[PDB]
C-alpha cells in the first residue's frame, strides 16, 4: 500500500518552503499513454469551392468552411466523440440535414460551446485550446461529468457497485469522500461552487483584526464555508493530479503576488469558465437530452475541472489541435 521510489519533485516556490509537485513516475507514464491516444490531426485539405453555407442546407455554425474542410471537421468530430458509433450516431444515414436524432442538436450547441471556450476563455486555455476530445475522449458521454449529487465511479465507463449507486443511501459518505481526495469533508464542492456563480470561494479575512459589522452572530459566514472551500480545493487538487503548493504558498492561502503561482490565477479563470459552461451551455441541455441521460433531479451532466484535466495539470499534458482545426476557435 505504498509507492516505491524514486519520486519526481519540482520547485514552485522560494527555496526552503517545501513547495512543488511530488510525482510517481509510473503514474505519470500511464497517464501520458492514456492521453497519447489523442488522434493525430487529419491531413490538411485545399480550401477550394464555395462555402457549405451554399452547398449544404442545414449548416448554421460552420457555414464558412468549404466542402472538403467541412467534411474533414465531421471526420474529426466522429473520431473525438463517437468513433465506435460512427456518423449515424448524430445523423440519419438517408438525410444528413435532418435533426431527428438528439445528438445532432446537442453537437451543434457543443460546436458553439467549443468555439466560445477557445475564443472567450483564452485566459484559461491559452493557445492550447480544446477540441471535442478534451472532454469526450472517444465516447458520446464524457468519462468525467457531474450531477447535482456526487456519483461513483468518477469515470462513468466503469461499472458501479451497488453501494456506489446513487440510489443506495448507505454509500453517500463514500461518494462524497472520493470526490474530495478521500477526505471526510461533508460537502459537495461541485454543486456548491462549480454548477453556478452563487457562492464565494474565499473565506479568509483580509484584515488582521475582526471588522465590526461582519464578525458577530448572523453577520458571519458559518465555519462550514471554510470546510466547503477546503473540499473544493481537495477536489481541484485531485482533478489536476497535484497538491496545494502548485498554486499556493500555504503561509497565506489568501494572498496573491509572491504568495501565489501563475497557475493559481489560471485556476481562478478556470472557475469562471466552468461556471459559464455549466450555466449557459451544459445545464440548458436537459431539455434536449433523453430522460436516460439526466440525473435524479432532471439535470443534464455537467463539467468540473476533471472533465478536461483528468488528473493532469494541463489536459493531455498540453497537447493541442488549435492550428489544425481553426474552425473550433479562436473565431475572429
Amino acid at each position: 500500500c505504498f509507492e516505491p521510489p524514486p519520486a519526481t519533485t519540482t520547485q514552485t516556490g522560494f527555496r526552503g518552503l517545501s513547495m512543488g509537485e511530488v510525482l510517481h513516475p509510473a503514474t505519470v507514464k500511464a497517464k501520458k499513454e492514456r492521453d497519447a491516444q489523442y488522434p493525430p490531426a487529419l491531413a490538411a485539405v485545399k480550401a477550394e469551392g464555395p462555402p457549405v453555407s451554399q452547398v449544404y442546407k442545414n449548416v448554421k455554425v460552420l457555414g464558412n468552411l468549404t466542402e472538403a474542410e467541412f467534411l474533414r471537421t465531421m471526420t474529426a468530430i466522429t473520431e473525438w466523440v463517437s468513433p465506435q458509433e460512427g456518423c449515424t450516431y448524430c445523423h440519419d444515414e438517408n438525410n444528413l440535414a435532418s435533426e431527428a436524432k438528439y445528438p445532432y442538436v446537442v453537437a451543434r450547441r457543443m460546436l458553439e460551446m467549443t468555439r466560445a471556450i477557445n475564443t472567450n476563455w483564452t485566459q484559461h486555455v491559452a493557445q492550447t485550446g480544446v477540441t471535442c476530445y478534451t472532454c469526450h475522449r472517444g465516447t458520446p458521454l464524457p468519462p468525467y461529468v457531474r450531477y447535482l449529487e456526487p456519483t461513483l465511479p468518477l469515470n462513468n465507463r466503469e461499472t458501479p457497485t451497488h453501494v456506489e449507486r446513487v440510489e443506495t443511501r448507505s454509500g453517500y459518505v463514500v461518494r462524497l469522500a472520493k470526490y474530495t481526495a478521500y477526505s471526510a469533508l461533508n460537502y459537495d464542492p461541485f454543486t456548491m461552487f462549480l454548477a453556478n456563480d452563487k457562492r464565494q470561494v474565499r473565506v479568509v479575512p483580509q484584515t488582521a483584526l475582526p471588522l465590526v459589522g461582519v464578525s458577530r452572530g448572523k453577520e458571519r459566514r458559518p465555519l462550514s464555508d471554510a470546510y466547503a472551500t477546503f473540499a473544493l480545493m481537495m477536489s481541484i487538487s485531485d482533478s489536476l493530479g497535484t497538491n496545494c503548493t502548485f498554486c499556493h504558498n500555504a503561509q497565506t492561502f489568501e494572498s496573491w503576488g509572491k504568495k501565489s503561482t501563475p497557475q493559481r490565477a489560471i485556476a481562478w479563470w478556470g472557475i469562471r469558465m466552468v461556471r459559464d459552461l455549466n450555466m449557459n451551455y451544459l445545464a440548458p441541455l436537459n431539455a434536449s437530452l433523453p430522460a436516460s441521460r439526466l440525473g435524479r433531479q432532471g439535470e443534464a451532466p455537467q463539467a468540473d475541472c476533471r472533465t478536461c484535466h483528468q488528473g493532469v495539470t494541463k489536459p493531455l499534458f498540453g497537447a493541442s489541435r488549435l492550428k489544425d482545426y481553426p474552425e473550433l476557435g479562436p473565431i475572429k
Partner: peptide
C-alpha cells in the same frame, strides 16, 4: 513553520 506548513499540504491533508 512555513516549510512544515507547505510540506504537510503537499500531501493534501
Amino acid at each position: 513553520l512555513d516549510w512544515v506548513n507547505n510540506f504537510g499540504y503537499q500531501y493534501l491533508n
